[PDB]
Design an enzyme around this catalytic site. Structure first.
Site, short mmCIF file in Angstrom:
data_model
loop_
_atom_site.label_atom_id
_atom_site.label_comp_id
_atom_site.label_asym_id
_atom_site.label_seq_id
_atom_site.Cartn_x
_atom_site.Cartn_y
_atom_site.Cartn_z
N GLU A 80 22.48 12.94 65.50
CA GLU A 80 21.44 13.49 66.24
C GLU A 80 20.48 12.48 66.62
O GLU A 80 19.73 12.50 67.63
CB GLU A 80 20.64 14.18 65.25
N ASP A 108 25.22 17.68 64.72
CA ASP A 108 24.25 17.20 63.97
C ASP A 108 24.65 15.90 62.88
O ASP A 108 24.24 14.72 62.89
CB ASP A 108 23.17 17.84 63.22
#
Lengths: 194, 49, 51, 247
Positions: A80, A108
Site C-alpha cells: 500500500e 495491501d
RNA sequence: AGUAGAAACAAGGGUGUUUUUUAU
RNA sequence: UUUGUCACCCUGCU
C-alpha cells in the site's frame, strides 16, 4: 486540518499520503480527514509490519526493536505504500512464483504464514451493510480479509485471526484515541483551460 | 515507463523483491540476501534522505 | 501546368480566417490552441545565413 | 550482484547522483535520445568513403575479452579508442570474419521457431509445381489486398496483451487475458519458447510481424488470396503469365 | 595554373619551451 | 625575419 495533527504522527505518513493523493486527489476540500482515513490505514498496517519476524514455522513472534538479529524476513511486506508501477509489479511477481491468485482489485499485504494477501480497510460505523459491498467487490479474493470499525468491532473470514491478540486492544486504543481527538474537534461518527 | 518518482527510488524498490522472491523464496543461497539488503539500505541512505 | 511563386504569396492572415471558419461552434480552448501558429507566422523574423 | 554494485558505484561519486535523483521517471524518455550527432543526408557516399578507413565500425567493449588484437598473420582486429559519446570501441571489419572463422559456437534449435514466418515461405516454395506460359494480354485493376495472412482475427490491444504476457511476464501490469484463443496462443508460446537467449525486442518484433495483419494497394490480374501475392513478380507480367500452385 | 559558376575549393584548430657559458 | 629550437597533439557532414 491535520497540519496540527502533524504533531502526532511521524512525518513519513504525510510523506507517503501527499505523494499518493497527488495523482488522484488534492487538498482543496476535506482532504486532511481523507488524510486521516489514509493515516489510520497506513499506520495500522505499518504498526503490524514493524515487529514480526517469522521463525522456521509461521505465527510470527514479536521481536525487540532496532536489532540486527538472525531473522529479518518480516511476515508482511507493505504493498500500500508504493506507486502502481511497484504495486501491480509486486502482485504479479508474487502471483507468478509461489503461485497465488493475483486479485481483480488492489492488495495491501502478503505473508509467508498463509501465503496469501490481506485486506485491512476500515469503515466508520456498523459494517452489517458495507461488508456486503466489500464482498461483492473483491469477490472471492482468496487472501485473508478483515474489515474494521471506527468504534472497535472486529471479525473476519475463516473465524481465524492474524496473530497475538494484545494487538487487538492496542489497535483499539489507536482508534479510540484517534476518535477521542476527533470528538474533541470533529463531528466524530456523524474542462480544459487555455 | 511512467510515474513521477526519481530513478533511484524505483531501482531500489525493484531490488528487494528480487532478493526475497527468486533467490529467497526459491531455495537459493541465504548468504547473498544479507549483503543485498545491506547495500540497498546503504544506497537509500547515500541520497542523504 | 504549374503555379508560379506559390510559397512567396499566401500570407498567414488568410490561414487565420480559414481556421476561424473551420473551428466554428466548438469549445473555446480548442480555437485558442488551434490559432497560435498563424499568429507567430504573421510576426516572424527570418535569419539571413552565414555572411 | 553487479546490479546493486554498479548502482552504488554510480551514486558514490558526484556528477551522477544529482542526475539520478533529479530526473523523474517520466522524463528519461527524453534524455535517452539526447545525442550530439546528426542523421545523415547521403549514406551511400559515406559508406563508400568510410569503408577505406582503418576502423570503420563499432563494437561493445567486451570484445577486449573475446577477440585478440593481432591475428595469425598480424592484422589488427580492434583499436584502443572510444567512440563519440559512448563507451563502445572502434573495430575493423576483419573482426567479423574472425568471429565467423574461429569463434564461440552455440545451439540453434530455437532459431526456426522464433522466425517461423520466414521458414513458412522457405518450405512453401520448394513444394510448388509449375505449368505452361500463356503469352497474351494482361488487364490489371488496382485493389487493396492483405499482404500477410493475419494469424488471428484480433487488433493491436490484445496483440500487446499476448506479447507482454509471453515475453515480459512479471511486468504485464494489471489486466488478465479473457478469451480462449489468446490463452491457447499464450501457452503454446510459453512451452515452446522456454530457455531462449534471443533479445526480447527481437522476439517481440517477430511475434508482431508474425501475428498482425498488414494490407496494401496493388495491381492484380489473377486471383485475390494471400498465399498467391508473395509470388506476384513471378506469376504475372504485362505480356506473359506463368502458372503456379504453391504447396 | 586548375576545379568550378551567381560562391566557394586550392586544408582548418589548439600545445609548447626562453639574462652571456667550453667543446667534441 | 626572430627573443627562438625545436617538438607536439587533434579533425574529414558539426
Amino acid at each position: 486540518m491535520e497540519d496540527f495533527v502533524r504533531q502526532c504522527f511521524n512525518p513519513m505518513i504525510v510523506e507517503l499520503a501527499e505523494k499518493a493523493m497527488k495523482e488522484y486527489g488534492e487538498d482543496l476540500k476535506i482532504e486532511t480527514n481523507k488524510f486521516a482515513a489514509i493515516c489510520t490505514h497506513l499506520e495500522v498496517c505499518f504498526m503490524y509490519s514493524d515487529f514480526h519476524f517469522i521463525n522456521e514455522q509461521g505465527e510470527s513472534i514479536v521481536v525487540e526493536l532496532d536489532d540486527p538479529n538472525a531473522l529479518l524476513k518480516h511476515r508482511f511486506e507493505i504493498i500500500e505504500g508504493r506507486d502502481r508501477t511497484m504495486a501491480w509489479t509486486v502482485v504479479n511477481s508474487i502471483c507468478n512464483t509461489t503461485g497465488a491468485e493475483k486479485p481483480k482489485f488492489l492488495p495491501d499485504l502478503y505473508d509467508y504464514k498463509e501465503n496469501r494477501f490481506i485486506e485491512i480497510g476500515v469503515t466508520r460505523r456498523e459494517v452489517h451493510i458495507y461488508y456486503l459491498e466489500k464482498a461483492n467487490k473483491i469477490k472471492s479474493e482468496n487472501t485473508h480479509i478483515h474489515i474494521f470499525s471506527f468504534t472497535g468491532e472486529e471479525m473476519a473470514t475463516k473465524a481465524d485471526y492474524t496473530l497475538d491478540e494484545e494487538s487487538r486492544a492496542r489497535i483499539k486504543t489507536r482508534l479510540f484515541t484517534i476518535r477521542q481527538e476527533m470528538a474533541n474537534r470533529g463531528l466524530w461518527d456523524s474542462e480544459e483551460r487555455f | 515507463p511512467v510515474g513521477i518518482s526519481s530513478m533511484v527510488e524505483a531501482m531500489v524498490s525493484r531490488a528487494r523483491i528480487d532478493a526475497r522472491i527468486d533467490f529467497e523464496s526459491g531455495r537459493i543461497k541465504k548468504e547473498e540476501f544479507s549483503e543485498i539488503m545491506k547495500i540497498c539500505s546503504t544506497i537509500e541512505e547515500l541520497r542523504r534522505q | 501546368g504549374d503555379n508560379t511563386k506559390w510559397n512567396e504569396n499566401q500570407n498567414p492572415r488568410m490561414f487565420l480566417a480559414m481556421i476561424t471558419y473551420i473551428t466554428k461552434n466548438q469549445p473555446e480552448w480548442f480555437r485558442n490552441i488551434l490559432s497560435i501558429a498563424p499568429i507567430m507566422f504573421s510576426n516572424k523574423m527570418a535569419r539571413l545565413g552565414k555572411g | 550482484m553487479e546490479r546493486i554494485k554498479e548502482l552504488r558505484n554510480l551514486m558514490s561519486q558526484s556528477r551522477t547522483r544529482e542526475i539520478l535523483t533529479k530526473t523523474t521517471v517520466d522524463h528519461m524518455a527524453i534524455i535517452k535520445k539526447y545525442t550530439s550527432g546528426r542523421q545523415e543526408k547521403n549514406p551511400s557516399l559515406r559508406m563508400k568513403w568510410m569503408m577505406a578507413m582503418k576502423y570503420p565500425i563499432t563494437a561493445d567493449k567486451r570484445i577486449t575479452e573475446m577477440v585478440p588484437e593481432r591475428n595469425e598473420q598480424g592484422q589488427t582486429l580492434w583499436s584502443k579508442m572510444s567512440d563519440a559519446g559512448s563507451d563502445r570501441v572502434m573495430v575493423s571489419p576483419l573482426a567479423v570474419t574472425w568471429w565467423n572463422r574461429n569463434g564461440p559456437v552455440t545451439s540453434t534449435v530455437h532459431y526456426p521457431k522464433v522466425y517461423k514466418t520466414y521458414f513458412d515461405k522457405v518450405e512453401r516454395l520448394k513444394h510448388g509445381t509449375f505449368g505452361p506460359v500463356h503469352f497474351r494480354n494482361q488487364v490489371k485493376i488496382r485493389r487493396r489486398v492483405d499482404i500477410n495472412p493475419g494469424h488471428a482475427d484480433l487488433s493491436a490491444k490484445e496483440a500487446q496483451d499476448v506479447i507482454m504476457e509471453v515475453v515480459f511476464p512479471n511486468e504485464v501490469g494489471a489486466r488478465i487475458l479473457t478469451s480462449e484463443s489468446q490463452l491457447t496462443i499464450t501457452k503454446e508460446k510459453k512451452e515452446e519458447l522456454q530457455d531462449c537467449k534471443i533479445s526480447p525486442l527481437m522476439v517481440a518484433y517477430m511475434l508482431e510481424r508474425e501475428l498482425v495483419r498488414k494490407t496494401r494497394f496493388l495491381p492484380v490480374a489473377g486471383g485475390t488470396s494471400s498465399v498467391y501475392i508473395e509470388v506476384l513478380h513471378l506469376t504475372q507480367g504485362t505480356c506473359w503469365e506463368q502458372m503456379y500452385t504453391p504447396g
